[PDB]
Amino acid sequence: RQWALEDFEIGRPLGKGKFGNVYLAREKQSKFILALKVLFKAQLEKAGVEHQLRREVEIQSHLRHPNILRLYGYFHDATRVYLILEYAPLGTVYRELQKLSKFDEQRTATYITELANALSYCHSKRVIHRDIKPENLLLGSAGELKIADFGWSVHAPSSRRTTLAGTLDYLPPEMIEGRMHDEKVDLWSLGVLCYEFLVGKPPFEANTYQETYCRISRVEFTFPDFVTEGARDLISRLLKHNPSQRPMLREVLEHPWITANSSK
């Protein structure tokens, strides 16, 4: 109803956010296990990103899809805002990638399928996520991928967007150049993820931000030799400078590499 901190038992930190930690929690009456995402009000106000939190709450609250992390509610006290989230027991894809170094083709294609299903649902609501990097992809109890952290998202029903957003390694040319952009930004990020999943490093990685920026703007990346011809085909189609040349999400879900390797 009108949630408050006293309605939850608190446990260990699950991870560290920009504005506070995410804690394991339990709603007292139901005993149901959840996550409480904490944001410090003074931090938020100093950074001037209150609108990102408002969008996160306004957008993620209304999404209902098995591959999107649920946001159940929110509350605040004198110093903090709390978001009540679905708990993802198996952690981030980021940690899995660190542990395994790279994913085989079956695991990669299955994640891409789940990501494309989730993004299809988002884009049907005309929502753009814009920050789908591995530390924002969580894993449910059956190892299924869940898109989380909608603080960079936007509801873009008609107009194209111009906000500088997201995380450099995952952004397309039109977003790092601050040009107008649309839902095709998520298709580019999907190509970055597919490459990073198979290789272990995102394709434009460089030791300076300046070089990474230039590599992205000129689509300068190469494939290691173990990346198969089908994976190369998909990734190359997703990482097109021209947003309109990037495939539709239906075409990703139908790609012969995806259907031959995905278990989903």
């Binding site: 950074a47 001037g48 990103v49 500088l164 957003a165 997201g166 995380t167 450099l168 300076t208 931000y209 300046q210 920026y213």
Partner: peptide
């Protein structure tokens, strides 16, 4: 008001070595 982290870092690089 705060830009994405990468904007701040790339501006540092420019101020630091051009």
């Amino acid at each position: 008001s705060e830009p994405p982290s990468w904007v701040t870092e790339m501006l540092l690089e420019k101020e630091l070595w051009g």
